[PDB]
Design a protein around this nucleic acid. Structure first.
Ligand SMILES: [Zn+2]
Ligand SMILES: [Zn+2]
Ligand SMILES: [Zn+2]
Lengths: 152, 155, 157, 156
RNA sequence: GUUAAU
RNA sequence: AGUUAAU
């Protein structure tokens, strides 16, 4: 009668031994919301250093701690580009008044976000061929926008 | 704990430093409804402008029809494809089926459906068509698209 | 956090107006019900993205009107209707309806021929519309009408 | 009127004969939750004996582990692949850090991940793999995974 | 004041 | 010609 906890996380695999509900019509709403988020997560994953996070991997490479190799930093960066969308960014861009230096940085990250969609495999490579000084300011500019869009 | 705002937009990338909740079970319903919409926007995008950004697509098309704001024909054919891909042919067919037959509005309802459909299969070759097509009639196929676009969303 | 009124263009997908639209495009400020319908319009775009007299009818009506040789249907147009209908049925649902009735029963071969079409067509609708464009008109009508009723069976009781 | 039960499960196909709502703007919010789950299940399915249906994939695997129900190795590998695709790597890395250094359980956790990932990339060759492992080693992989599956979902 | 799917 | 957004 209660919603099956496995169904909530995707799909019950316990055949007919399972006496919990698999009928969405019978489910309270929270279970239908929670289930939609595990399912979207699966659907998104199907279309392709751990306690630091991708962010702490990038904050460490800028700062040269925790021995982060440049290769491991462009892989992280690729992941952080996929979490940003270019329209939240184009809204930021056209609230900065004209000729502000901050417009060119905005368009620069957009080109990488867009290049990363088409193919994250060669977008990593275009980043490695950057020299670190400029790679690290690019990295720190996309960090700043990440915190900015999301918090405040 | 409160729901991690990075998680609401996708997936937190802050590792264990982040002490907000990443557990959908604890979240209030609004954060789950919001996250779902950020997530569908992301799924949809992953299967595929010089301060005319303020006009929008619709403002670029309406300035082109009226020959104002320096909207060249090329950038209005591009914008016309954007508009096509946002209409859904089904709710045109809906409207076309509410009219008496041999009303002239029916033949307008089918040029749009052929355009939204030709644009879905090939967005570009459809653009090709649009930019060779004499500005006279393109401007009324645009104004017809733009009227359907509005009326669908006005009840 | 403060509630606003939602852009009804954005509710149906993406607003194309720009800084001219003075309605909310920020989901953090919409009321629950607007977040609920957006998702439904957005799921229809996603699904559509990876797949006049006849629309009056519908697919069931153009299929039903084939059982009575009515409204000048064509075998070609009644088979497209059928695939379109199979892609609407779900392959795990008639496996429920096939594991409840007694063994050596006369309604398992229909099921398993439905199961055998539901997913012989999940692959492509070219080989499966031909797979019945050949089947005889007698067996067609009855086998077209066999899925029609599993369709309303599943959907109501 | 009440929402069309055919549109709840997808796309009503009755044309204009249908006397129920097809307008999401008018629906009670529960029907829109349900429809989304029905459509999520469909979006996801479109990205690819039989009395074993009663058993389900877990029935089938428990059965193999205990030499019950005449379950061939092929059939327990298939089902092990399906069991894998229902697991997500991130949930168990959550636990791999909750462990202590040089536990045994860090060895098992690492191994199922290698299987999830290979199962994602090529599920047909992960099955080919599982069907060459020593029968007893296969069954403990299987038992470990079943147990991870169980407590992922029931252990807060 | 002027704009408005207030 | 007042309440709500935008200037
Ligand atoms: Zn269950
Ligand atoms: Zn808008
Ligand atoms: Zn209906």
């Amino acid at each position: 009668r209660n919603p099956c906890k496995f169904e909530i996380r995707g799909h019950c695999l316990n055949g007919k031994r399972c006496h919990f509900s698999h009928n969405y019509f019978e489910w309270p709403p929270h279970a239908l919301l929670v289930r939609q988020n595990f399912m979207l997560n699966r659907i998104l994953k199907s279309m392709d250093e751990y306690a630091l996070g991708v962010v702490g991997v990038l904050e460490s490479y800028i700062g040269s701690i925790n021995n982060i190799t440049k290769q491991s930093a462009c892989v992280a960066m690729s992941k952080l580009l996929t979490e940003l969308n270019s329209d939240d960014i184009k809204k930021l861009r056209d609230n900065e008044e004209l000729n502000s230096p901050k417009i060119r940085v905005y368009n620069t990250v957009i080109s990488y976000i867009e290049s990363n969609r088409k193919n994250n495999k060669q977008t990593i490579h275009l980043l490695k061929r950057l020299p670190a000084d400029v790679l690290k300011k690019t990295i720190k500019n996309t960090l700043d926008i990440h915190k900015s869009i999301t918090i405040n």
